[PDB]
Amino acid sequence: FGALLA
Amino acid sequence: GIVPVACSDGYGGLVTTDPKTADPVYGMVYNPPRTNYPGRFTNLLDVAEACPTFLCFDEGKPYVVTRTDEQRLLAKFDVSLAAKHMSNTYLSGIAQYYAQYSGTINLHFMFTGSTDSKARYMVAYVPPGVETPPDTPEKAAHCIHAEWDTGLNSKFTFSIPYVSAADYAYTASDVAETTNVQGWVCIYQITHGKAEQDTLVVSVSAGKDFELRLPIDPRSQ
Amino acid sequence: GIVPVACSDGYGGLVTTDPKTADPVYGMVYNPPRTNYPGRFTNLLDVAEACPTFLC
Amino acid sequence: GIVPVACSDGYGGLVTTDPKTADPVYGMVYNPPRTNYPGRFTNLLDVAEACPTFLCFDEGKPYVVTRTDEQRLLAKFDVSLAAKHMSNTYLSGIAQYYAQYSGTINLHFMFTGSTDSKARYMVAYVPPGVETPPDTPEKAAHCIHAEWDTGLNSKFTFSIPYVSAADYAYTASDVAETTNVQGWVCIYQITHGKAEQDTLVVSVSAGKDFELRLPIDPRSQ
Amino acid sequence: DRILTTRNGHTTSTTQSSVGVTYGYSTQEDHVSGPNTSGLETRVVQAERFFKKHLFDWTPDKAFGHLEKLELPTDHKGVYGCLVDSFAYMRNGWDVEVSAVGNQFNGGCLLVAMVPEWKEFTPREKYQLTLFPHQFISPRTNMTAHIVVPYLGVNRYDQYKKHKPWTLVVMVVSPLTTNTVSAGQIKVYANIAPTHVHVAGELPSKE
Amino acid sequence: TTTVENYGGETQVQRRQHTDVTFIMDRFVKIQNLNPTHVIDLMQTHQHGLVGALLRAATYYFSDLEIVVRHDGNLTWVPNGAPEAALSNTGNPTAYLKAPFTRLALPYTAPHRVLATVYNGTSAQLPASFNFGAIQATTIHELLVRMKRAELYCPRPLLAVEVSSQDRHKQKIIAPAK
Amino acid sequence: TTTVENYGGETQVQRRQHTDVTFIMDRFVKIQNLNPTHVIDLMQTHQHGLVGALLRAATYYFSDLEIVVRHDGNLTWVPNGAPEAALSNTGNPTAYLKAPFTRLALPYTAPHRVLATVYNGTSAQLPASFNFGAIQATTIHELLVRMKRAELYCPRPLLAVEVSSQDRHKQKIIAPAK
């Protein structure tokens, strides 16, 4: 859910 | 023969700002590459426009508050880069090295209250020409002003317009000046609901068309 | 070597009407526009020819 | 009239390194041809890279030896062009006239023992950051190192890598420097077989990327 | 929507109270390989992961200007820490996340910033800390600040035992306010992770 | 960024030439603490001077230099990292006395890619390698430094004089006589 | 030639401009032992001076010259092989006193294809023909020589100061004050 900063 | 010349009187002296370049004495020096070094700035105003700094209020506070919930003037300050309220800003730090300016100056307001606190503020630009600043929103309403709520967006921005007779204005303020030359900015609290201990943080940055000209070295050295 | 020159006697002095221009020291100054400012005169005689004045 | 000029203050003085050339006074001198004169060098580093010179050990010896056949540190020296062990090298002789350097430095090892003597050595680069140099091969093994045998090829070469924070390093060493800034080089004898009186001659030359910059005249004159 | 999940190595942080990620000065890293390392540098990904540290307890008594700092890197008892003792030179960026958990009824504001070459700031200079990569934390808006900065400094590689380029700074902009419904105090924690970790001069064993 | 258009105004054209970093730093400034043997360190400029303060308003910088020196005897310059003893020999760039003073162009010679105005650690004080070399002469009366091709990185606080008047800092501005 | 590639390293790019023979020798150096009548001999440079030592680090050399002379009265130069008595006549290149000193360009005038810094035999001392001529004036206060278009052949030893400290030769390196 939402944004990812992998 | 050789070339005849006339050594002209009044020329040749060293001028701390002349465009001449000296003669090199140590050549062929290659310096480590600086390509892609982070954080470079090429113009002071690029920084001044992107990084608002805090205004200075009552007791060195970058914010204003209020206990009563009636209409009241929260703060009033001179529209001068030499104003006390601006003394700790980056904009004023930069401006002190220039004799003149012109353009927009941006004020940023940030509400730090809890979710259960709401407030309605008003900011107005009072041009020069009046003896004393308006003490109430009613009187100030006739001036260029903006009013706003504190909801999901706790931040608000207002532009102080450049409005003077001349195309430029001085950055410094002369001792002769009784009433500020560029007018005042007034921040009122129309009213609030349970926001007695909550504050409004104010900061300032340069506007898109803000401009400084004529560099000077004024500080006492 | 370098360029040989002869500093000539009698030249170089300041003359209140010489055509020389001094060296600039403060650059890049842009001045407010003056285009279309009313009442400009470029020659004294233009004025003298269009505005008679009273004899005494 | 004639050309007006401004004799500028601060210019014109003689500078021992200026690029100006004087005015000739005796012309048309033809000199005997020098085409094809043997042994010309155009760059000091070409020579420094092709002619290793001897390091200076214990008693002005360009070599190290050992009586015991156990693991032992044969020699340890500062990775500095001002190191005592380098004091008699051509590289240091050249380096003294430059403020900074960077690049590879090559160490050459030559075994002078008889055919009946065999030995196994190890050389390691100990970067700055440790209080004292490793006294045993075991400890030094974790550093950049090389180990080798003495057989038909009695010569071995090892490159001391340039590893520092800055892109350049000083050639001189300041009195403030307690522990060497560029680390140490350690030469160990892993073990040997009947090589008690046999020696290992060590020399140094410049690496392919060794570089010196910023000439100086430091010697007391 | 407003829910951010950051992942560094085998560690993740899912923040629901996020404003976004602020990248300081640049989004790219100056070539990790330069002439000062003679191509002997390597990357140690096993060290690029989160580690925690408590900064301070934000209370109503702390007024404007109260400043807390954490110079990076700090003592690390993990893989990263091992690197610091095994190599002479290192370089790395920082993925920083700071959280001040209270409740929507607390008021007040905190300034979270990453400062290059820390120096003790004077009361007056504090009004300009926004000149540095920062983000604000205000209970009504967010409980988590998130900043990402690259490596920098006069030298391409550093010796962290002698110099610490980046310094995390948290300052009270507006004091914490409390209701009968709010929290009494807010504990500020930091979730930090080194980035693009490179080592260079391998040292000997201390035994 | 907000503009006056929000309430019917019109944003004008701006000429930021004078706030250009390279331009503003490009001028001569004094260095007050002098000695017969002096190491050129830009941090020796006055902290409130036009250039001194702007320089300190940045973390990292780079620039070549141009200097003016009024001295007695001959002037000798030595690059960054050179032994102090070298200043005594003519092999190094030496300028022979020519009134009223000597003006030279010096290149950046530090071993670092850039220098800093503040350094958090040990080499308080800044590392010794943060210099543009040293100059020496029998006597050095005055020294003017000029930053050529300046580059500034990572801005830091810059302060105006603090105000006590509680409203505006007033001071005598130039005006005609009579 | 070995490189750091042997153990995983990477050889970098090098700029050898400063170790170029022509460039390095191209600068003014002093000559200390002076007389009203002086024969220009490059071996009169200091043995440890930047140029003096580098010159001695070569067996054979060639170069034109440029000199600076601070003198009283007029300066007269005479070519290699000229009778000493000739220095008294104006027919030879003579420079009339002009403060603060005289700077001239002189050509190599030796009868040999090249000169030497060491000579094993008789013409210890070097042959008398190893000179760039002679100069004369009422009084010669200072003399600076400069090797133009220098060429060096057959390198010889070049030594650094010897070390006693048994580890490193340490000396005061320039650094900021305060």
Numbering used by the authors:
A (entry chain D): 80 to 85
B (entry chain C), D (entry chain C): 1 to 221
C (entry chain C): 1 to 56
E (entry chain B): 12 to 218
F (entry chain A), G (entry chain A): 12 to 134, 156 to 210
What does the paper behind this entry write?
FMDV is a non-enveloped single-stranded RNA virus belonging to the family Picornaviridae. The capsid consists of 60 copies each of four structural proteins (VP1–VP4). The structural proteins are arranged in an icosahedral lattice of 12 pentameric building blocks which are the major structural intermediates for FMDV assembly and disassembly.
Here we have rationally engineered a disulfide bond by mutating a single histidine residue at position 93 of VP2 located at the icosahedral 2-fold axis between adjacent pentamers. Initial production of empty capsids utilised infection of mammalian cells (RK13) with recombinant vaccinia viruses that encode a P1–3C expression cassette, where P1 (derived from FMDV A22) is either wild-type (vA22-wt) or carries the H2093C mutation in VP2 (vA22-H2093C). Two of the four animals immunised with wild-type capsids and three of the four immunised with mutated capsids were fully protected using the criteria described in the European pharmacopeia. Although as yet we do not know if forming a disulphide bridge will be possible for all serotypes, especially in the baculovirus expression system, our results demonstrate that capsid stability can be augmented without compromising immunogenicity and this might be a general tactic for improving vaccine efficacy.
